[PDB]
Symmetry: D3
Subunit: 308 residues, 6 copies
């Protein structure tokens, strides 16, 4: 009685997941107006069924978020037994603190919206800040791409046993030290003051910039120069979420990266056509597995240190 639906026309990721579960994506009649006012219609009964809605990758974040909330609403009032929002890349995740300003904690607002819309459970990957799980009261499964990253590293970087994992900023210290300790290698950190300061040993070593996401890439691009100027043999950047908006693709093609690796939490096909340094790690099996485990009441923690 499992039912999986896709956000928009970006069946992409959602279709891979459905395939891995031996299912077809459920039918959804969609109509979009001038004003981008989204009207959705669930094309099949979900009464008494375990529903999973996978968010699109359309690019327009507000349209995608509303579409998601609207679909959650529709399934809930259509008597679904349970509705789970599968959100690979959590919207407004970066806006999770006030940081000495009269700003909104939009990530909390989003969590509240998902809650009132009718979400009973959230499945996501690499929340920008683990504390975001505390923005909900409903259970959240925060999947890590770490296992998949450690594996990609050991298989694609010959010098991995002597590389350095580097955080592009101060906040990612924990993330990198965790990966460095697992691989038993060094770590380093970059801190932007407009000037970057690097601490840690990278000389004559392969440097691997690791972060949860990359958007305009101004930061990772500048970190790469800094790393090379410090004596790094070559530089890689591995982000789980590849937003790559604005001049990102332009900055990547010009940067000194050996390669830029990201998962497919966000559609990457079009970006790859204009950027060859980009390589993608498919995380559909991890999302597919978490969904199947959630449905069967089986252990999902198994995926935090294991590549299905």
């Amino acid at each position: 009685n499992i039912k999986i639906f896709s956000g928009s026309s970006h069946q992409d990721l959602s279709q891979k997941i459905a395939d891995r579960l031996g299912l077809e994506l459920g039918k959804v009649v969609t109509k979009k107006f001038s004003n981008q006012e989204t009207c959705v219609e669930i094309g099949e009964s979900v009464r008494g069924e375990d529903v999973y809605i996978v968010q699109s990758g359309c690019g327009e974040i507000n349209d995608n978020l509303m579409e998601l909330l609207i679909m959650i609403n529709a399934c809930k009032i259509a008597s679904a037994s349970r509705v789970t929002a599968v959100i690979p890349c959590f919207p407004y995740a970066r806006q999770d603190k006030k940081d000495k300003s009269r700003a909104p904690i939009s990530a909390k607002l989003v969590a509240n919206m998902l809650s009132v819309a009718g979400a009973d459970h959230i499945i996501t990957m690499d929340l920008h800040a683990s504390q975001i799980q505390g923005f909900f009261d409903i259970p959240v499964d925060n999947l890590y791409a770490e296992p998949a990253v450690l594996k990609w590293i050991r298989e694609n970087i010959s010098e991995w046993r002597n590389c350095t994992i580097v955080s592009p900023d101060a906040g990612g210290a924990k993330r990198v030290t965790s990966i460095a300790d697992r691989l038993n290698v060094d770590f380093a950190l970059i801190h932007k003051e407009d000037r970057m300061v690097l601490v840690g040993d990278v000389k004559d070593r392969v440097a691997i910039l690791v972060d949860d996401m990359a958007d305009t890439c101004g930061t990772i691009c500048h970190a790469a120069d800094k790393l090379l100027s410090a004596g790094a043999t070559r530089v890689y950047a591995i982000l789980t979420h590849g937003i790559f908006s604005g001049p990102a693709i332009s900055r990547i093609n010009n940067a000194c990266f050996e390669a830029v690796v990201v998962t497919n939490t966000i559609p990457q096909e079009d970006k790859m056509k204009h950027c060859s340094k980009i390589q993608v790690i498919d995380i559909s099996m991890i999302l597919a597995e978490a969904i199947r485990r959630t449905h069967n009441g089986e252990s999902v923690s198994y995926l935090f240190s294991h590549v299905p």
Copy 2:
């Protein structure tokens, strides 16, 4: 004590409102990220103030709604005393029932999002359906453009004394009969066979005034006009409180036989009017300004009805 902020670049309506109240719009820094991720930042203290946020009138409904929600939230966690959302045109108002389908009741979702965002009060105009008020637990003041529309009809159509108020569809019956009744004239309604349109009511040799709460692509209201002409209507006018003139609208009305198309200021019309001469806008900023002033001073708002 009172503070008024505006959403998006849209400030025409917002500025009109602040002026009428003798105030300047609150300062707010708005940076739109990559994927249009909305970033807002209240530029001044609202601690303990009676805050009013006037919704943007900038086409993209989802960006507008998110910015409004984010602004409400920022003010609330900034210890504002009270936050009122002033929403001339309630987003997703049309999606207010299932209509025999597994559809969302999006207008209730929106009501819930505004509530959890921290809105203490809502001020809107001509809700697509009065019942939408019940979608909230917080107070909602639903202002009407009817008085102004009535007044415009009497002062612009010489034959209004014996005109016919026509509803573009079955659902607008209550709206047109309310107006026809106030003016003491005939009403008629059109329905698309479920397609061919059918007309019930007397419009032969008399001015036909199409009335509807809103019109987007204007395909419905335009086709209704033809029917009205074929039915022997002298001239056909069209009055919409919310003019969401998108897509083919801008041209459809020109190519249409409308003697004129009247809409309110609830949504920015300057851009359109340029490419459309027969459009006339009724300014409702004064009505909204008065509602805010009364809401703040605890004065009666019903009088504006």
Copy 3:
């Protein structure tokens, strides 16, 4: 594990439903005081069971509503797995807007009361206004009597292919056009200003007044005269909810109706004894079916265009 209970002594409708489900109504010890203070006692365990409570027809709306809420409360604190309020005719449904006055939206208050009492699901028929579903957050199944009305029409009115469906008021335009389009006949509308205005073709045709409910019947009675004065061959009135209070039965016996048809969402037996123009459409099978579908997680939409 389905359990069905009846509101009060009006086992009537609730017993037909239980019979159709092959069940007996659950035991309920009831005690009513002077002040009509209702004390209820569930006479059997409902722990872990799917409960359905059918509202009475006692006539005293406030007593019935409280009794319903009290029973919902009792089952919920008695650990029922789920409690569904089966409310054929929704209380205070007409009070669903302010309509330019400082009035209560009692229909919303009622929905909130049902929610805090512990209702997890609502099953009702022909809500006065579809928007009422939005007064709840829990799922609502709003059954239509339309299929049963269209069927009664085709079977009891010879001239149905040439009749006119008429709305007694402005608000019922949608309802009638929907029925007219399905039958492929005309529609007409009556609007009261103290004077009625009729628009639409009814001359030399059978006119069928269709509405969701009839109370004092002053309106439908006056609409019938109006229709005949306009050249209608004869007039019928089909309401799903037959309140028939005050001088209704007197006004019906004197009116020019060929017949007045209503469903049994409200007990009609006593009214029929004093009014022979009244005929009843039994909707117990529709309620019974919706309940069985809800329980089995099967499609209830099937009943929106199909007579079980």
Copy 4:
């Protein structure tokens, strides 16, 4: 700023309260539909006001509760600043526990209905059980008639100095011992074998004063009186704060040997007193008026205890 409205035709208590506060009762149109469907309509603006709704005292508990709820809701969506429900006699207060059965905790249901209706504060008198206060999350002020009862006992029973306060049943023990203690006298309690009544305590050759929070049919309090006589009670009085004298009550007390039956103004007694001479009512309107005035002015209400 302060506004007082009354429920149902009952206005005796409501009018007494408004008078003591130097106010007139708010205007409210009340049309009772067919099946007694309650229709209410606030006749004036309450926007930003401190509204107090005094419950009806008109027998039908469910109609009364619905009218009270509907009134609270109307005021709340009318932007009232605050809504306090003044409920002398809390409906369904007796149904406040399961008592080893699959029964409703109706008093908690009622508390929840009042809350979701929008009540911000409750003012009541002698809750059947103090714990009922915990059924709300909003503030509840539970006034007591004890001081007034005490005062009436001392000024009406010459032998009060050595009288016995008796509880009609096991559950009223705490209530009677509290009074007996204040007056410095004996207490006794009666219990129906679960039936024959048993009496524990000394009442022989002394006035017996039956005390109970409420009495409906008076079958319990009347039988208790006989027992008290058989036990050698000089004379037997009966003091109830809530006199819901329904059914056989009106006559049972007459035919009873009560030297008198004292009740408060929490429920309309004029009608009954007519057919019953030995009934005496303690007016509590002043107590309620003072609670409202203090609630509004932020003054101490506990002093009234």
Copy 5:
């Protein structure tokens, strides 16, 4: 899919329950800081499982309450299907009214805390005041020790058919009359004014002081003297909850009780070592049974008048 966990190191009662259910207590990694800041870690998946958490007996009520809430929180966000708080002796139960003072109704606060923590159901024994069930909205099963007390009485007191059940205070009138009527014996009540007044017949009879709990025991000890001074042959005290704090054990050893009986809702082993008048009624089977019934959706009312 039933999972039972214990509050703290006091596996005691919780282990007996688990044994009776044929289960082992679930694994829980616990770490306690200086400040008694409790950090818990569920050592096994509870995803999709029916969870029961039994509160400790550690003695420090606030530490136990927090630990309980924290464990409820952990299981809820760990996706448990349902979480039930099994609380033998409800915390702050006595603080359930204002009683003419500006005091907190802590029992209500506790119920709210248990609710927001994530409790879906409460199982407890002899709530100080039945009204406490109304402090929650989630279902509460309030088990009675009465059946076990009536049984202990008939089996350990030869003169039980001619004894007197006595309430140590005014509030316990109902409790005792209920037990007296079941046994068909007399009842009596004690009321403290600093002076106790007794009403009821105890002369030449065995007096049994019955109450829900005993703490410092100053009250029951003074009631015993009073009873003997009134002509009682001997005195027993049966409390369901034996807090026995402060000088309780000292006051019991000196008092004139034939014996003081309590259930094991609270660990009694250490207290027994210093007090031989104390005897314990094991109520683990009742808690075990209520849990098994709750899980299987079977009747728990069966335990209100029956000793499993």
Copy 6:
């Protein structure tokens, strides 16, 4: 209108705050039952007042939290106008994420308990993580000790102009770089191999200032100091905003090479300082007093940041 109450016997901080505001602490009777069952009783009326409850600083975190919750609840059901919890050190702040385990997010539990207890506003200092603010729906003002720490560094360390701010672990990076940046100096971070500690950053021949939001047993900060010395640090200082010096802390710092250990007044330090000479406390009562005064008067609190 404003009332300030204190929790537990702790009143040092509370008294300092009331003094700065020209007020006396509200009266509250506190009886601790048997199993430490917390019993509180507001000794005066708070009806309609702006109540502020300053958390106890008495070691036992669970007793303190319960007393705070019980006090909030008592005031709320006593009709207080508004209840603000002033919590210098947010309990369970460290338990704010699952960290890849089936662990509680205790800090969110606490936030929820405070909310349901009736807290309308929270005032705290240096939340272990800014995100904790999002655990509430009610407003939270997170004050910072940074300005005061900065000021203390400049006025007590002669070599501060070229000192190195060091973080005891990976998680404190953002905190130290923020300070190092304000002072225009170097930062360094230490990490325990997951064990041996690693150090990244330049501390050779220069004063090392260990900065952390809090320190309990001081095992982490003490070991970090050794490392710093071995790395060639001139002298090593330690600055903690919350000094929960429990267990071995009191001695570990003495035996440590700290040139000094600076902590704020958020937790009682008098007792400890006695057995530790190198401890210096920065008083933050003025910062809290100002936050309360501004919160009450609707004045800007952000200025204190």
